[PDB]
Amino acid sequence: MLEKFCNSTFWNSSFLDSPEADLPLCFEQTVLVWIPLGYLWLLAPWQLLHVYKSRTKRSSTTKLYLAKQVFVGFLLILAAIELALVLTEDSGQATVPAVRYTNPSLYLGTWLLVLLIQYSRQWCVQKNSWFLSLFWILSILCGTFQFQTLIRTLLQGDNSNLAYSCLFFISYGFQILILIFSAFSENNESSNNPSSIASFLSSITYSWYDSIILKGYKRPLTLEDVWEVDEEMKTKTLVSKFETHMKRELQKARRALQRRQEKSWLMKALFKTFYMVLLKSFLLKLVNDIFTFVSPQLLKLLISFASDRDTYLWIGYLCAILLFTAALIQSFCLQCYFQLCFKLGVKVRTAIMASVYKKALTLSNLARKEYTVGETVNLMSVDAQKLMDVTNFMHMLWSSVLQIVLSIFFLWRELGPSVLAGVGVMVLVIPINAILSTKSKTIQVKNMKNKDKRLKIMNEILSGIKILKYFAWEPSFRDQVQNLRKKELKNLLAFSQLQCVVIFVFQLTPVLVSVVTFSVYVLVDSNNILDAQKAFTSITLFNILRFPLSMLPMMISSMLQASVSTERLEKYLGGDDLDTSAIRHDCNFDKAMQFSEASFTWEHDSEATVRDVNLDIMAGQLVAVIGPVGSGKSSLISAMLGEMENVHGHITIKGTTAYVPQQSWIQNGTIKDNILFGTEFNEKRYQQVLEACALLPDLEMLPGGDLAEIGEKGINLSGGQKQRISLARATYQNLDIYLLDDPLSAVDAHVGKHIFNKVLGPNGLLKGKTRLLVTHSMHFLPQVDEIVVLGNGTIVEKGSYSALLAKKGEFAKNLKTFLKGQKLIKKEFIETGKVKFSIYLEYLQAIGLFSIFFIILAFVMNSVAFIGSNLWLSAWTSDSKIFNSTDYPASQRDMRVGVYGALGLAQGIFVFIAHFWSAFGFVHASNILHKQLLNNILRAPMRFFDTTPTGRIVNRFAGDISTVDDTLPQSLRSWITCFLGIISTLVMICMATPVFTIIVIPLGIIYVSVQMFYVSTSRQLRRLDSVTRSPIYSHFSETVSGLPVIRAFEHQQRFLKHNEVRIDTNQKCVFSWITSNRWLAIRLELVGNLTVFFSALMMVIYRDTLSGDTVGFVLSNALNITQTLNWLVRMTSEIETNIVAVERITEYTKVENEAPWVTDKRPPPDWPSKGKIQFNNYQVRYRPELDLVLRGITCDIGSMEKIGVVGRTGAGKSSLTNCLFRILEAAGGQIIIDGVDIASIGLHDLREKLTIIPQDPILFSGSLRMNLDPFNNYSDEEIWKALELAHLKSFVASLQLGLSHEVTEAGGNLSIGQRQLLCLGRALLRKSKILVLDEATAAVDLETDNLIQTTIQNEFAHCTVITIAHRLHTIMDSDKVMVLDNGKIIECGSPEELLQIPGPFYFMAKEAGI
C-alpha cells in the first residue's frame, strides 16, 4: 500500500522464513513507529485537558524533574539535526523518500508535546501517571525491533546509514534512561502517605509498600506506623455518597409497599452507588482471562519447537520471551484487579458499618424493642463482614462460566456431536447444585437467628454482672447460653456437611464427563478409533477447567452467607424511624410549652399512658409534677422528647430542652468530659456548677479528683454521685427548658436542701429558665410555682401549693402521711513476637487427635490415588507406540479407560470423606473453645470486669469466635490440600528422574525466605485489626445505652463524628492489610514466572541433545510446582494470620479466678440458724493498687437484730455489703457468720443463703418469671404470693399477658419505680435468714415506701436485716444503728441512746429534721 513511501515492501515473507530472519526496515518506520506515536495524539488531549480541569496548587520544581525535561529536550534537538541532515546532505539530486521527511518531523512535533504533558503533569498530585509511563514501555519495546535490524546491517558490513543509524541509538538510548528517571522515581512532601504518591510503574508492583514491611521485620508494627487511608475512601465521603442513593431506593420501596398493603432494595442501592469500581474490575477481568489462555498456547508452541529440530532459533527464543512477558503482564493485571475488589470490599464494609450506627440513633422505640445493643453488634460485626467477603469472589459468576465454554471450545475440535452427552452431566450439576442451595440457605438463616439470641442473652449478662455474683446464677446462665450454642452448632454442622456435597460434586464433574464422552464416541460412531491419541492430546489440559470449578464450590458457599446477611441489613435500615410531626417545635410562642389534649402510647396498639393531657406553662416557671408509682410522670417528660408516639393530639414547645433521665446515664472518661459533654470549656462557669451542685466533697476522695476516669455505666460512683453528675451536665449546658425527672432522690436530705435552693431554687442558677420537676419527696412543695398531680396519665389536680391544700382530697392526706490510681481501663496487651506453638497445640487438642490422624490419612491416602491416575496415563500413552491402529483391541483395552474412570472416582470419594471428618472435627473443636471461655469469664473477679470495658469481652464472642467457626476451619483444609499437592508433584518427578528433584532445594529457600520475611508484617496487621475494633462496639453500646439524653441536647451530629472517626482508625489497619497481601503476590509470582522463564531459556540453549517429551515433562511440572508453592506460601501465611483469633480467645481462658464456688468444706445443711455476724477489724481494698477503702472494721450483730447503717455519701455504706458476699478478698481481718468462717468456705456455699437488694435495679430480657426465678425451681402459685407482698400484684394483674410478660433490656418496659419493687420481689422468694437492703426506697413514694416497710417489719420476723439507707425515716425502727465514715465505724447502739448523747448521730438527727 505504501511501497512507494520507502522504495520497499510491507514484508517479504521470504525474509521471515530464514534462520537469520529480520523484520523489514520499511515496515518498522511505518507501523512500529506509528503504534506508540498514535498513542499520544489519539489520547493526549484527553489527559492534557483532564489534569488542567482539576488544576491543583502550584508544583515545587524538583531536582529530578529537570533531568526528565532536559533528556526529553535532547530528543528534540537530537531528532532535529537529522531532519536538517536530510536537507543538508540529501537535498540536491538525492532521492528523498517520504520516510526521511516524516521520521524526524513527526517526532519533532511529538517530543514537543512530551514537554507540555510532562510539564502540565507537575500540577497533578501523581507525578508519573500511567499515560506517559506506558508510552516509554510501549515505545521502547516496539522500537526494539528497529534496534536489532540496524545492528545486523551495521555489524555485518559498514554502510552510509551512520548518518541516521548512529543518531537513532542515542534517541533510543535516552528512552531507557528516561524510563528509570520517570517511571520509578517518586518524591513529594504532601498527603502523608506514599499511596497517593508513586510513579505508575511503581504503583503496580507495590514497591511503595516496602517501607511498612521492612519496619515490621526490624520491630513489631504499631497503630502509629500505618498511614491514614487516602481521602478517596474516608468514612465521611462514603456515608454521604452511599446515603443519597439509599434514601432514594428506600423511598421507592416505601411507596411500593403501599400497593400491597391496601390489597428488597439494599443490593440495588450498593450497585447504583459503585458504578466504576465494579465496571473497572470487569474490564480488568477480561484482560486477565485472555492472558489465561495465552500462556498455555505458548507452551504448545514451545513443545512443537522443542520436539521439532528443523525449526529456527528465531521462533525458539522469541517464544521464551513471550512466555515471560505474557505471564508477567498477567501478574500485574491480576493483582491490580484483586486490589481493586478488596477495596470495594473494605469500601462497602464501612458504609454498612457506619449506616448501621446512624440508624441506631433515629430508630423509633417500637423497632428497638426488637433489636438491642447485642443484636445490632452482630449486625455490625459479623453480618457486615460476611458482606465484605463476597466482593472477593463476586466476579466468579461469569468469569468462570466464560472459561468453561472457552475450554470447551478447544475440546470440541477433537469431538463432534458426542460431547453433547458430555455437557449433559455438566448441566446435570445445575439442578443438583440448585436444590442444595435452597436447602443450604434455609439452614443458614436459622444459624444467624440463633446467633443473635446468643449475644442478646449474653450482652445483658456482661452489663448486669453484680447480680450474677450476688445470687449464684452463674450455673443457670452458664447452662442456657450453651443450650443456645448447641442449637447453633447443630445447625452450623449441618451447613458444613452440605458444603461437603457441593465440594464433592465439583471435584467429580471433570472426571465424570471424561468417562461418558468416550463411551458415546464408541457407542454410535466407532468407525474411527483416534489411534489412542485421545489419552493426553485431548486431555493434556482437559482438567484445566478444575481451577475454575475448584474456586467455585467455596465461592457459592460465600454467596449464600452474603445473600442471607444482606437480608437482615434490609430489615434493620428499613425500620421506621421515630416521628417528630406531632411535636410542633415552634420558635415564637407566648408560653413555654402547650399540651393540646395530647395522648401518647408507648406502642402502636396499646392504651396510651398519657390520657387527655391538657396543660400550659408560662415562659418562666417551676412545675413539680407528682403522683403514684407507674402513673406517667417519666413518660410525660419522654413524650415531649418525641420518644412516644402521639394519637389524637399534639404538643408545642418553644426553645430548646435539657433532660435528666430517671435512670442516670454516664459516659466513660473523666468527670470533666461528662459535665462538659463536648462544649467549649469555660473555667468561669465550671467552678460555679461544681460549687453550686454539691460535688466538691465528692471530688475529694476520687483518686485523680476532677480527672478521675469514670467506669462504663458509672461503676466507680454510686447513686447520689451519679445523679449530681447528671444534674450538673444539664445546668452547665445552659439551655432554655430543663426537664428534671427525679434528679435528687439518691442524694441525702441535707444535700438535697443545698441542691434545691442553690441550683433549682427561685434564686438558684436556673433563675429564669423553665424547669419541670418530678419529685417523689414532698419536701420542696412550698417553693414550687405550680403543681400537677397526675395519676394514670391524667391531670387529676392542678394548682399551687396553697390552692391545692385548700380543697380536702388526696393531696391533703398525701402531705399528712409525710408529716495515682485514677486510671481504670488499660490498653489491650497485644502479643508481639509470634503465635506461640502452644496455641496451635491447644486448638489441635480441641479437635479430636483421633480425628486429625484420620483427616490426614484420608488426604494422603487421597493424593496416592491422584498419583496413580496420572501414572496410569503415562502407562497408557505408551500404548500407541507398541500397538497400532489395527493391532489395538477394544474389548481388552477398554479396561484402560475403565481404570481411569474408577480411579478417578476413588479420588472423588476420598476427598469427600476427608472433608466430612473435617466438619465433625472442627465443629466439635469450636464447641470446646466456647465452653471453656464462657466457663472462665463467668468466674473472673469483679476487678476484671470493672477495668475491662464491655467492648473487649463482647468482641471476643462475635468478631473472633466466629472466625474459628467460618474462616479458620476452611483455611486449615486448603493448607493440607496444597501441601499434599507438593508431595504428589515431587514424587512424580522423583520417579521420573533420580536426583533432578533437587531443583526444589533452591526454590524452597527462595520461597521460605520471602514467606518468613512477610509473615511478621501481616500478623501484626491482624492483631491491630481486632484491637482497634473493640472501641467501635464499646462506643456503640455507650450511645444506645443512654439514647434519650443525646436526642434531648440534639448532640447527634457530634456523636456521628466519633463513630465516623473510630471506623477510620479501623479501616487504616485493614486496608493496609490487603495491600500487604497483594505485595506478597507480586513480589512472589515474579519469582514464579522468572523460574519458568529461566527453565525455558535453559531448554532451548541445549535443544541439540535434550529433546522429546522431557521438554513437556519439565515445563509442565516446572509450571506446576511453582504454582502450588505460590499457593502454599499464601495459605501458610493465612493460617498463621487467622490463628490470631484463637490466640485472643485463649487469652481470657487463662485470667485469674475467684475462690472455688464449692470446696471440700461443706457448711452444715442448716448452717444459717440464728444470724450471728461478727466483724474483726476487717480491711478491704477494691484493687491491689489502691488504699484501704474500708479500714479495720470491728462490730457484732445479734441474731434476728434489725440493724441499719447510716453515713455520708461514699463512706463505705455500699462497700460494707459487698464484703459479706466476698465480692472482694479479705485484705485484713476476718468475718464469722453463725460461727462459721467466711473465707474458709466456697462462694456458692455462702451466696445461696444471703439476700441483697442492690441500689441500682438491673433486669434481664425475657419474661418476669426468669427475672424472678431463672433456675425455674419455683412454682407459679408462690410467685403471686411473693409478688403480692411487694405490692406489685395490681400492676401485673392489669397486664393481660401478666406473668409471661416481656421485658426489654435493663427493664426498659418497666418504670424505675416498678423495677425496684420487682427487684425487691427476688428478695422475698429466697427468704434467707440474712437480707441486706441497699437504698430500696430511692425510687418509691412515701405511701408505697411505708407499705413495703410494713411487710419487711411484719412478714420478716425471723431474719436479720442490714438496711443501708440515706433518709432516716426508716432507721429508728432498727434495734441498733451503725455510723461509719472514711471506713471507720463511729457509733453503735439503739437510736434512742445515740440521741440522748450529743454526737455525730445527734447532729445527723437534728439536720435530718427529726
Ligand SMILES: Nc1ncnc2c1ncn2[C@@H]1O[C@H](COP(=O)(O)OP(=O)(O)OP(=O)(O)O)[C@@H](O)[C@H]1O
Ligand atoms: N419504654 C417503655 N415501654 C413500654 N412501656 C413503658 C415504657 N416506659 C414505661 N412504660 C409503661 O408506662 C407505665 C409507667 O409510666 P412512666 O414510665 O411514665 O412511669 P414513671 O414516671 O417512671 O414512674 P415512677 O414514678 O413509678 O418511677 C407502666 O405501664 C410502664 O409499663
Ligand SMILES: Nc1ncnc2c1ncn2[C@@H]1O[C@H](COP(=O)(O)OP(=O)(O)O)[C@@H](O)[C@H]1O
Ligand atoms: N468500682 C470501684 N472501684 C474502686 N473503688 C470504688 C468503686 N466503687 C466505689 N469505690 C470506692 O468506694 C468508696 C465509697 O464507698 P461506696 O461504695 O460509694 O459506698 P456507697 O455506695 O454506699 O456510698 C469511694 O472512696 C470509692 O473509692
Ligand SMILES: [Mg+2]
Ligand atoms: Mg417513674
